[PDB]
Amino acid sequence: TPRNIKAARGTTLRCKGWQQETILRLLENNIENGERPEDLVIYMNAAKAARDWDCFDAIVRTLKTMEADETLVVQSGKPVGLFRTHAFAPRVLLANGNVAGRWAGDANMFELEKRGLTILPGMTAACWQYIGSQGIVQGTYQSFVSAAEQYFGGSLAGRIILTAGAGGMGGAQPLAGKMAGAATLVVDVDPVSLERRLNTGYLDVIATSVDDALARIRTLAAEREGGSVGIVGNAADVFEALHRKELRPDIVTDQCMVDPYRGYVPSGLSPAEAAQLVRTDPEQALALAAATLARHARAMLRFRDDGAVVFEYGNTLRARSVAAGVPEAGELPSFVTLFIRPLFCRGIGPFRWIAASGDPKDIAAIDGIIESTFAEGHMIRQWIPMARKYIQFQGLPARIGWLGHGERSKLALLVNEAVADGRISAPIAFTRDHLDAGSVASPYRETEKMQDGSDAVSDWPLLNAMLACSNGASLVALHSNGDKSASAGQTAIADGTPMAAFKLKSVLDADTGIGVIRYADAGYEVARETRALHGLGIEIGGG
Amino acid sequence: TPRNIKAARGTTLRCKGWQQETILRLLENNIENGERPEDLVIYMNAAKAARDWDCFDAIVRTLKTMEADETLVVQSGKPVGLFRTHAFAPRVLLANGNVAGRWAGDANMFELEKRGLTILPGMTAACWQYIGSQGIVQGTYQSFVSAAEQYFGGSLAGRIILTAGAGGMGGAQPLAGKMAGAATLVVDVDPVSLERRLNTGYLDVIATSVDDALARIRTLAAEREGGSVGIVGNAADVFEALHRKELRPDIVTDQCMVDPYRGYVPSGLSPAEAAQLVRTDPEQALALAAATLARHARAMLRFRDDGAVVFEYGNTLRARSVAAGVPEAGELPSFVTLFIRPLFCRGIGPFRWIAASGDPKDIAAIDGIIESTFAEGHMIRQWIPMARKYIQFQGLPARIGWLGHGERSKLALLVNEAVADGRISAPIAFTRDHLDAGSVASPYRETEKMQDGSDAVSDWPLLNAMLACSNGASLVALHSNGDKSASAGQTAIADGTPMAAFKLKSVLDADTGIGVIRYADAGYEVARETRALHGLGIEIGGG
Ligand SMILES: NC(=O)c1ccc[n+]([C@@H]2O[C@H](COP(=O)([O-])OP(=O)(O)OC[C@H]3O[C@@H](n4cnc5c(N)ncnc54)[C@H](O)[C@@H]3O)[C@@H](O)[C@H]2O)c1
Ligand SMILES: NC(=O)c1ccc[n+]([C@@H]2O[C@H](COP(=O)([O-])OP(=O)(O)OC[C@H]3O[C@@H](n4cnc5c(N)ncnc54)[C@H](O)[C@@H]3O)[C@@H](O)[C@H]2O)c1
Ligand SMILES: O=C(O)CC[C@H]1N=CNC1=O
Ligand SMILES: O=C(O)CC[C@H]1N=CNC1=O
């Protein structure tokens, strides 16, 4: 018998107070929007909201009975203690997925998870900050727009984007590409993944074959219209076929789950046969997945040699391809270094907010505060109309709205006032992905090729989490992805009170502040000037 | 021209308040007691108080001007930002030495430190919690006493302890062994190290040769008296010679710095020639250091085959010896699993406190509160007279006093009252090593062979640091030692105020609480009962 978790709607408390209730609803919202919610899996195949259902039930009970001056402590998805702290402390502290680095290799991480000692935490899966496919779509859209500005004269009309991966997060690629004007073709081996994008508005059409997809993409390109087409098939086989048939894409990227232990499908298997092979014969699953990934990466490089702009989109494809024997895949650029890093230098990152009421009018109210607040032509003034027009709510109504240093606390204080005075019906939860300037160390991705070589320095997310606790964030998390990266998340709730006014301002300005500091420290001049302008620095002699 | 840093004494503020002043004095005290203070090196050859002297000068300026509701942020020894937080937040957040695990190997850590991107933080070096050789001496003493209880009928009279390593931390072995009744022989390659122990009261006599050392040790053993003798020589050569000459030690351990990049001396070189070889030809320095370490480990194993109790004392000798080609060294037990783990199950760990005044009467006052507070026969009632009789103050007067869950906050509240009412002249700083139940993940040491296999799970120190911030610790740090371990430190200051009363109780009970939780989670029955008794648990079904 299925759980079918849904977040509570409306304005009735089941907990002792709105801070606790909002976090409960965020946890419930994660599972409501998850890719495999009956396994607690939220996205990327195995990133979970809780270690297991008994752990989930205990977390829920504790949120319903904890006081506003108590702090629940969660360890890799498992509630482990409830401490009396104080009103200005967080209500929940989480550390998920962290393993000392020498033993945090891929094989040992898989063993530890299989024995119940750890979970794959993702970024927003295990600390309850997921808002469905919307959470990533602004960054995927921004990446395509910036590609268009840098390499295609500022327009994707008539241009073709080819990608793979229509999962919980990759599912935003087809919509991102359509919004940016491109004829967008997404490959996924699982027809269920395409149907789920088709039903949530993220995909327009599912093709019946490669030939059919080719025809529909050429039509969109010839009309110079944005639209998206899905193909069912393995990226390795389909990318090869698309080259034989002369697709000639302008952009090629990929957002499959390429982890051979967790959801990469070898050529000729289904998702279920692959999961079963990992269970019964992992050495053969690994060999088969590497052979498919090698072809997959070679197909992208073949497009790159014909003239396509090929980049990695944050799924570790390059490093895993190099390990599977494609050394040239290590030479591919990344969306971060081509498009996102100059935004991080200004503290601009995937800020986001969730209506705890479940009422879409609460989001439309905040979209309205944004249009009265931010200058015309600002990034956010261009984005909110796109979101309004193209993005269907999933679970609790929520909005991705990238904003930068000082802008996040400005918006959150105006929302907190709007909660206090009745324009918004219930608290708003502010959070963000961990793909942000001051909250992640990740040499394969966010911090690849730092100007000063500090790629792997992970002091920075630890400081980000310690500041969030010290500033009164409602919920703070520290996550790792094996031995490859470390990140910090935090949630801060606008409940209309003055206490929340103080917290929203302290937390969010320090959250973007430490990111600006981090990039100024690396030597990025735009960050150094932002740091100086906002008084974020410390004067050190002998410079 | 040398800095010659000394902590300020007396009751005059140079900062805006006693929280800031106490932390300034702790930072100054670290360098005053450091093994190489003109290089900012505190102990283990390269663990530093600050990234460099310019960083140190900026930290000092900021401590003198920051307000009581501001938080200084330090990144691997470098001040990087000053944030407005609140009165109940920490005054200093530090993250030192952390590198994402895939790139945190020994060779890359050495490169990153050489380029100024990171520091070796030790545990108490980079977050200003060091009290000279006293910080480790209770744990070294406790280890010898427990060895005596388990293997020698409860007495070391007439017994011989052989060890190596008379550095800042290894220097406590000769005194620990003497206090426990043994004839204790310590080998060190550097006569300066022995002279410094001889001058601070940690070593009785320096031998002039192996033959001389042998004679003085046999005399102490025959009188059945405790005493210590130092030999100048390389452990590899001296341990071999001691076996040829038939020392027949009862206990053999080692506390050299065995890191070949940082202070392990190959056989036939001096400390200076070795440091120079690392600089000019590190591949040969590594080869020579491994050959010496192999012999060093084989000499210990030869004693073990004659019948000595041989254990590792926390310096990574086993793992580095296995890497140097001695696989049998991996089979040696460790002081943690033989002697310390049952203390961690009760939350008992290296708690410690420092008189900010610099006045020894403030320590004697707290020694007196302890003798009126703790039942006769309690561990601490046996230790304080030993400390009083054998331990010379270094720098600011300070006391190591291992205590367990609820005992630490009990003592700290009584001290805070004694500060409020004049028995103690100025604030007392409470802190601890990071070798503690809830504050370190370390498979080679503190968490080797956890009953449930969770050795490498490092969620726990991250939670320890997040709780310390949320509970108002004065100073919180997160440290790593390469890819091998992660730890959390915190300092909480008894300044006589009610605000400090609240903080001391919240911080310290959560600091020991999370350690008890951590061991109960692993299945240790004494910890599970402590967790139940103090209401630290969370009920989870399907158990
Ligand atoms: N770029 C970013 O900022 C960003 C954001 C979130 C997710 N990610 C990464 O994106 C990846 C995907 O995440 P997700 O949540 O969408 O994962 P998911 O598990 O929900 O979806 C992965 C999809 O890949 C498909 N797939 C697997 N092997 C395939 C193959 N050989 N050919 C074709 N399709 C194949 C599966 O059918 C599935 O639909 C992960 O690596 C995740 O870490 C990055
Ligand atoms: N067991 C514990 O709880 C504990 C506590 C603190 C320190 N430590 C560890 O103890 C070790 C020593 O720390 P420290 O602060 O004393 O270091 P240190 O650098 O101050 O002293 C190391 C000493 O080793 C000597 N030495 C080096 N190579 C030698 C050789 N081949 N033969 C003989 N002597 C040799 C040096 O002369 C030096 O005096 C480190 O690994 C540190 O991490 C463990
Ligand atoms: O942590 C990671 O590197 C992968 C998952 C994460 N990436 C983008 N968004 C997410 O939550
Ligand atoms: O962090 C480590 O493993 C070594 C240094 C540390 N050991 C004991 N005491 C200390 O401060």
DSSP string, A391-430: ----SS-EEE--B-TTHHHHHHHHHHHHHHTTSSSS-EEE
To the nearest 10°, the Cα dihedral for B59, B62, B68, B70?
Answer: -90
d(CA B436, CA B347): 8
Q: Does residue B318 sit within a domain?
A: yes
Question: The CATH number of the domain where A395 resides is what?
Answer: 3.40.1770.10
Rounded to a whole number, what is the distance in angstroms from the first to the last CA of chain A?
66
CB A205 within 8 A of CB A230: yes
Distance in angstroms (rounded) separating the CA atoms of residues A428 and A362: 8
Residues 443-502 of B with CB under 8 A from A: 443, 452-460, 462-463, 465-467, 469-472, 476, 478, 480, 482-486, 502
The answer to whether B471 contacts A62, with C-beta atoms less than 8 Å apart, is no
Ligand 2 pocket mutation pick from B48, B144, B231, B255 by most atoms within 8 angstroms of CB = B255
> From the DSSP assignment, how many helices (H) and strands (E) are in chain A?
19, 17
Estimate the share of chain A in helix, then strand, then coil, as percent rounded to the nearest 5.
45, 15, 40
Q: What is the DSSP letter of B63?
A: H
* Distance (Å, whole) CA B112 – CA B118: 6
Query: Do both A328 and A352 map to the same domain?
Result: no
Specify the amino acid at residue A106.
D
Q: DSSP characters for A504-534?
A: HHHHHHHHHHHHHHHHHHHT-HHHHHHHHHT
Are A274 and A350 in the same domain?
A: no
Let me know if residue B492 belongs to a domain: no
Longest CA–CA span in chain A (Å) reads: 67
Say how many Å lie between the first and final Cα of chain B, rounded.
Answer: 66
SS (H, E, C) B261-305: CCCCCCCCCCHHHHHHHHHHCHHHHHHHHHHHHHHHHHHHHHHHH
| A300 shares its domain with A389 | no
- The number of distinct structural domains making up chain B is 1
Helix, strand, or coil (residue A133):
strand
Q: Which amino acid is residue B224, in one-letter code?
A: R
Closest approach of B83 to chain A, Cα-based (Å)? 7
Portion 56-95 of A in contact with B at CB < 8 A: 57-58, 61-62, 71, 73, 75-76, 78-86, 88-90, 93, 95
Residue B395 DSSP symbol? S
Nearest atom (ligand 4) to Cα of B124: 11
The amino acid that residue B375 corresponds to is: A
The verdict on a CB contact (< 8 Å) between A81 and B538 is yes
* Selection from B257, B381, B369, B275 nearest residue B320 by Cα: B257
3-state secondary structure A31-53: HHCCCEHHHCEEECCCEECCCCH
SS3 readout for A73-120: EEECCEEEEEEECCCCCCCEEEEECCECHHHCCHHHHHHHHHCCCCCC
Residue B180 structure tokens: 């426990």
Angstrom distance (rounded) from CA A92 to CA A100: 23
Residue B128 contacts residue B30 (beta carbons within 8 Å): yes
Spatial distance between the Cα atoms of A477 and A327, rounded to a whole number of angstroms: 35
| C-alpha span between A279 and A76 (Å, rounded) | 22
**Residue B357 Cα distances to B25, B395, B426, angstroms:** 9, 11, 5
Q: Which residue of B81, B118, B466 is in closest CB contact with A476?
A: B466
- Assigned domain for B479 exists: no
What span, in angstroms and rounded, lies between the C-alpha atoms of A263 and A274?
7
> Does residue B160 form part of some domain?
yes
Q: Are residues A280 and A368 in the same domain?
A: no
Q: Tell me which residues of chain A, numbers 378 to 407, contact chain B at a CB-CB cutoff of 8 Å.
A: none
A300 and A384 fall within a common domain? no
Taking CB atoms and an 8 Å cutoff, what residues of chain A touch B506? 83-86
Q: Helix H segments across A105-171? A: 106-114, 134-151
Answer yes or no: do A302 and A379 share one domain. Answer: no
- Residue having the nearest C-alpha atom to atom 11 of ligand 4: B123
Contact B459 A98 (CB under 8 A): yes
Q: Å resolution of this model?
A: 2.2
Residue written as token pair 């800031």: B20
As given in the structure block, the two tokens for residue A138 are: 């602004």
Residue A188, marked binder: yes
In this structure, are strands A428-432 and A485-494 parallel, antiparallel, or unpaired? Answer: antiparallel
Q: What CA–CA distance (Å, rounded) separates B158 from B220?
A: 7
d(CA B380, CA B371): 9
Q: Answer yes or no: do A285 and A349 share one domain.
A: no
Are both A315 and A379 inside the same structural domain?
no
In b/e form, how buried is each residue of A439-473, taking b as 16+ CB within 10 angstroms? bbbbbbbbbbebeeebbbbbbbbbbbbbbbbbbbb
Closest CA to B354 of B68, B50, B29, B72: B29
Q: Is A235 annotated as a binding residue?
A: yes
Q: Kindly report the CATH number assigned to the domain that includes residue A214.
A: 3.40.50.10730
Strand A92-96 relative to strand A70-75, pairing:
parallel
Please tell me whether residues A301 and A159 are part of one structural domain.
yes
Could A100 and B483 be called an inter-chain contact, meaning their C-beta atoms sit closer than 8 Å?
yes
Residue B492: closest CA among B6, B7, B18, B10:
B18
Q: Per-residue DSSP letters for B30-47?
A: HHHT-SBGGGTEEETTTE
Task: With H, G, I as helix, E, B as strand and everything else as coil, classify residue A438.
Answer: coil
Residues B468 and B490: their CA atoms lie apart, in Å, by 7
What is the number of residues in chain A? 543
Query: Which two three-digit tokens encode residue A32?
Result: 């409501």
> How crowded is the C-beta side of B415, counted as CA atoms within 13 Å?
31
Tokens 């007691």 found at: B33
Indicate whether A274 and A305 sit together in one domain: yes
B240 found inside a domain: yes
CA dist., res. B425 & res. B358, Å (int): 10
What burial class does residue A534 get, using C-beta atoms within 10 Å of its C-beta: 0-12 exposed, 13-18 middle, 19+ buried?
Answer: middle
Q: Are A283 and A309 within one domain?
A: yes
Tell me how crowded residue A373 is: count the other CB atoms within 10 A of its CB.
14
Residues having CB within 6 Å of any atom of ligand 4: B 44, 122-124, 314, 433, 435, 445, 481, 485
Region of A307 on the Ramachandran plot (φ > 0 left; ψ -120 to 50 alpha; else beta):
left
Q: Which residue among B61, B83, B486 sits closest to A513, beta carbon to beta carbon?
A: B83
| Residues whose beta carbon lies within 6 Å of some atom of ligand 3 | A 44, 122-124, 314, 433, 435, 445, 481, 485
Q: What is the DSSP string of B64-98?
A: HH--TTEEEEEETTEEEEEEE--TTS-SEEEEES-
- Nearest of A230, A184, A180 to residue A210 by alpha carbon: A230
- Domain boundary pick from A307, A333, A359: A333
Helices (H), B133-229: 134-151, 172-179, 191-200, 210-222
The domain in which residue A508 lies consists of 345-429+440-456+495-533
**In the structure encoding, which two tokens stand for residue A40, read together?**
């607690």
Pairwise CA distance, residues B141 & B301, whole Å: 23
Taken as a whole, chain B contains a residue count of: 543
For residue A291, the surrounding DSSP H or E stretch is: helix A282-306
Which of B429, B428, B430, B435 has its CA nearest to residue B479?
Answer: B435
Q: Is residue B357 part of a domain?
A: no
B446 phi and psi angles, rounded to 5 deg: -60, -35
Residue that is last in its domain, among A281, A303, A333:
A333
Asked if residue A356 and residue A282 are part of one domain, the reply reads no
Query: Residue B20 corresponds to which tokens in the numbers above?
Result: 């800031």
C-alpha A492: how far from its chain's center?
A: 18
d(CA B152, CA A224): 88
CA distances from A483 to A48, A125, A295, A443 (A): 18, 18, 26, 11
d(CA B438, CA B443): 14
Report whether A499 contacts A87 (CB < 8 A): yes
Residue type at position B73: V
In sequence order, which residues have a C-beta less than 8 Å from that of residue B524 and are 6 or more positions away? B341, B345, B451
Does the residue B291 lie in any domain? yes
Rounded (10°) angle between helices A498-522 and A407-420: 170
CA-CA-CA-CA torsion sign (B228, B229, B233, B238) = negative
Tokens describing residue B477: 């740090």
Instruction: Give the burial string for A108-124 (b: 16+ CB within 10 Å, else e).
Output: bbbebbeeebbbbbbbb
B458 contact residues in A (CB cutoff 8 A): 98-100
Helix (H/G/I), strand (E/B), else coil: A349:
strand
Task: Report whether B453 contacts B398 (CB < 8 A).
Answer: no
| Residue matched to tokens 């500033």 | A471
Task: Give the separation between CA A396 and CA A358, rounded to whole angstroms.
Answer: 5
Helix, strand and coil percent figures for chain B, each rounded to 5: 45, 15, 40
A4 found inside a domain: no
Q: Can you tell me whether residue A490 is helix, strand or coil?
A: strand
Burial (Cβ within 10 Å: 0-12, 13-18, ≥19) of residue B86: middle
DSSP H or E run through A231: strand A227-232
CA pair distance B541, A62, nearest whole angstrom = 13
Q: What is the 3-state secondary structure (H, E, C) of A326-343?
A: CHHHHHCCEHHHHHHHHH
